[PDB]
């Protein structure tokens, strides 16, 4: 029997259900979202990988994804993304 595929579907759906609880999303639009998440992920990780080599550092690091997301994202979208990354790591490093 053919194996399971992989997608962000339940997470993006859950994210919709914490910003427009009243609203649904079409499977066509899910196909776009699942593509967009994979593309932004492949940009950030792919460009972070170059920072690791430019610095001759072996570890992909929160200290440095923070650079990639201010390189890729423009303007205030960068600043607010860096904020959410900062808050997330602040919770995680408090909880451990």
């Amino acid at each position: 029997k053919r194996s399971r595929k992989e997608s962000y579907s339940i997470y993006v759906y859950k994210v919709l259900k914490q910003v427009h609880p009243d609203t649904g999303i079409s499977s066509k639009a899910m196909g776009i979202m699942n593509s967009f998440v994979n593309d932004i992920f492949e940009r950030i990780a792919g460009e972070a990988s170059r920072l690791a080599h430019y610095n001759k550092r072996s570890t992909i690091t929160s200290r440095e994804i923070q650079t990639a997301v201010r390189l890729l994202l423009p303007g205030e979208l960068a600043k607010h993304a860096v904020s959410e990354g900062t808050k997330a790591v602040t919770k995680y490093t408090s909880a451990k």
């Binding site: 303007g75 205030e76 979208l77 607010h80």
Partner: protein, 50 residues
């Protein structure tokens, strides 16, 4: 029938095209409601307001 409600936006958009009162995109002029803005859009527009 109810299809007249979908046609009425275009009927108004045509009356506004005779008048030439349309915006820099040629659309009907439509109002802002600032509750529709994200926190980031609010920050950008509050910076545009300074």
């Amino acid at each position: 029938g109810l299809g007249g409600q979908e046609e009425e936006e275009e009927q108004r958009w045509l009356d506004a095209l005779e008048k030439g009162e349309l915006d820099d995109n040629g659309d009907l002029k439509k109002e802002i409601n600032e509750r529709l803005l994200t926190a980031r859009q609010r920050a950008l527009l509050q910076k545009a307001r300074s």
